[PDB]
Amino acid sequence: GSSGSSGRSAHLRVRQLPHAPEHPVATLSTVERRAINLTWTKPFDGNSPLIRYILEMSENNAPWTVLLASVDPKATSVTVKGLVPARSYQFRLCAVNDVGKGQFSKDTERVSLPESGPSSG
């Protein structure tokens, strides 16, 4: 009570969906203040070429918020500018192609920004 089927279909290349990105590593920007360098691996296009990526950020217990909608498919790294200092930030982008959107990568290692100014709280 779960599995589903319809037919099979066979004609022309198979339009596969691009799996989520791998090596979802997220490191701060040792140059740009309040910026994190997101790095992931190139997921399996899926017969068809990618189109764009949707990198959703998850703040302190914050819901996945579509930060970067239009992202380069040839890009495997992105920089998140405009962040809060002394706060946790999560990243997870998926692969989107003509076929459609696959899935998002695991929540990048709990990335925290550097504190700015006096300790508040």
Curated annotation (Swiss-Prot):
Could you tell me the superkingdom of the organism this chain comes from?
A: Eukaryota
Ranges for domain Fibronectin type-III:
20-115
Q: Which residues are glycosylated?
A: 37
Q: Where in the cell is it found?
A: Cell membrane; Synapse
Q: How does it assemble?
A: Homodimer; mediates homophilic interactions to promote cell adhesion. Interacts (via PDZ-binding motif) with MAGI1, MAGI2, DLG2, DLG3 and DLG4.
Q: Which family does it belong to?
A: Belongs to the sidekick family.
Please give the function described in this protein's UniProt entry.
Adhesion molecule that promotes lamina-specific synaptic connections in the retina and is specifically required for the formation of neuronal circuits that detect motion. Acts by promoting formation of synapses between two specific retinal cell types: the retinal ganglion cells W3B-RGCs and the excitatory amacrine cells VG3-ACs. Formation of synapses between these two cells plays a key role in detection of motion. Promotes synaptic connectivity via homophilic interactions.
Free-text comment on this protein's domains from its UniProt entry: The PDZ-binding motif mediates interaction with PDZ domain-containing proteins MAGI1, MAGI2, DLG2, DLG3 and DLG4 and is required for is required for synaptic localization in photoreceptors.
Q: What is this protein called?
A: Protein sidekick-2
Origin species, per record, is Homo sapiens
Q: Which residues of the full protein are shown?
A: 580 to 687 of 2172
